[PDB]
């Protein structure tokens, strides 16, 4: 799927991602840009405005776990459907997350990386990350 040069590109940039912040910024933007996804996080408290969403502690703590799982995916790019098997169960059996939403989060994460890295998120680097987030979206769909 990925070329050896694509894998090196994806890896190098991921070494520079703040893993305390990026996950939250992505989950945060998902809730603001596609507001029906707020239904799945009713227990997280106040999600009433963008400023509320982006400052919610529980959104930040949960984005850290989401980004943790993307990291585990980048370490097992060849075996994504195995790395994410328990996680597909959870999103389908307990919640029923329509699989279109997994594709939306992947694309919000690419925007947040663009936002953080600027001119360093070149078209070739973006094209490598689009392959990884499509990978992850497909292994979550149950």
């Amino acid at each position: 799927h990925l070329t050896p040069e694509e894998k090196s590109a994806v890896t190098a940039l991921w070494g520079k991602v703040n893993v305390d912040e990026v996950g939250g910024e992505a989950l945060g933007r998902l809730l603001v840009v596609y507001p029906w996804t707020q239904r799945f996080f009713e227990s997280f408290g106040d999600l009433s405005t963008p400023d509320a969403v982006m400052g919610n502690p529980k959104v930040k703590a949960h984005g850290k776990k989401v980004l943790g799982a993307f990291s585990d995916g980048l370490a097992h790019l060849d075996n994504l459907k195995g790395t994410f098997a328990t996680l597909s169960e959870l999103h389908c059996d307990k919640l029923h997350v329509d699989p279109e939403n997994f594709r939306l989060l992947g694309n919000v994460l690419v925007c947040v990386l663009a936002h953080h890295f600027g001119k360093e998120f070149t078209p070739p680097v973006q094209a490598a990350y689009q392959k990884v987030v499509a990978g992850v979206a497909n292994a979550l769909a149950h």
């Binding site: 603001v32 840009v33 963008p50 925007c111 663009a114 001119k119 078209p123 973006q126």
Partner: protein, 141 residues
Amino acid sequence: VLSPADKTNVKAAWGKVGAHAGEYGAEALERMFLSFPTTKTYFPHFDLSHGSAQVKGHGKKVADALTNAVAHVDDMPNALSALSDLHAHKLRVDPVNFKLLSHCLLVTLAAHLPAEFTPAVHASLDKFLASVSTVLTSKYR
């Protein structure tokens, strides 16, 4: 459907793009061709290599059209009726491809205008591009 706040957001953001709209249009096309290579099938007679002057000129046309869509955001079906004739009647572009170029434009604006691309603006821009996309893919004239 855009809220009144969505419209203020889009006008302010696109205004900041300014005289860079051409270069942003071209970069978004290059991102879409590289990340989603099936889209190249709509441009068979184009040179689509990196730094192509045809892509540069097309990116400028796409940007000028979005500027005009922004200035007529209340009356978009009427301001974009010729583009709609071209995309829905003549080219028959599959609507999935509009989601792809919309994403590549958001990525381009996020990489170049980071201070403007807040979550509120991101949400407005995304709704604007979906509405432009719906007018381009509909036969209504």
